[PDB]
Every structure is written in structure tokens, then in C-alpha cells.
């Protein structure tokens, strides 16, 4: 999770959060329980040109899921998502623990966004 990063989304602002909560809830789309299991991670990164296997997708939900459900909710989603737009590699020393898949941000905000960011 890097409670960090879980300060940095308490530093964010409801605005900055509010793209994300909505980006959270479009990226499970149709999920029973609302929290984005690796198949609406798949459906995102398919929606963003990545072909992944749940394998990959558990572990980029592994990055954060703090329940251990195997599924992110938003709060998870929103660490790793001002963990990707602070640094996914600006500057940092970082080793890769496991499928690196990571669309920047705003990019795959893109592809849930349309479902939000119009409509007026
Ligand atoms: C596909 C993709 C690209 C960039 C960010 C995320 N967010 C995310 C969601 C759940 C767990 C970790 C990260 C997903």
C-alpha cells in the first residue's frame, strides 16, 4: 500500500480523489461487490491496450489490497493511483516485485474517465 502514499491520498483533495473514486467505480463496472478483482483490472488495462492475465493483475491489486480480499477498492485503487502519478519512475531507485504493466495515470483515468468527464 505505502502508507505513504495512503498519506498522499489523504493529501489529496476530494476533487483529486473524486476522478479517482469515479475511475474506481467504472473500473468495476458490473462488479458484485464494487471493487476491482483482476478481471475489471483486465477489462481497464484491455480498455487501455494491455492483454493481461489475472496472474499480472493480482499483483498489481496485491500492490495494495490491504484486506487481502484479492480485489481493490477504491481507497487501494487510489493509493497505487497517487502512487502512479507521484511516481511510477520519475526519479526513484525502485526494483520491480512482480508484473510492471502500469498505464501513467491520467492515461488510464482516459479510459474510465469518458464514462465522467462529459456529460453536461
Ligand atoms: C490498469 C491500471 C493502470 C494504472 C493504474 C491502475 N490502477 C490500479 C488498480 C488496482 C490495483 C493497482 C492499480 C490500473
Known sequence: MDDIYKAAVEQLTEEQKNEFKAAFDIFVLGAEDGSISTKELGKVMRMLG???????????????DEDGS???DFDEFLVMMVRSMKDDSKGKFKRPTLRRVRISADAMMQALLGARAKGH
Open 50 to 64: 494491455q492483454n493481461p492475465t489475472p496472474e499480472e493483475l493480482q499483483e498489481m491489486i496485491d500492490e495494495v
Open 70 to 72: 484479492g480485489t481493490v
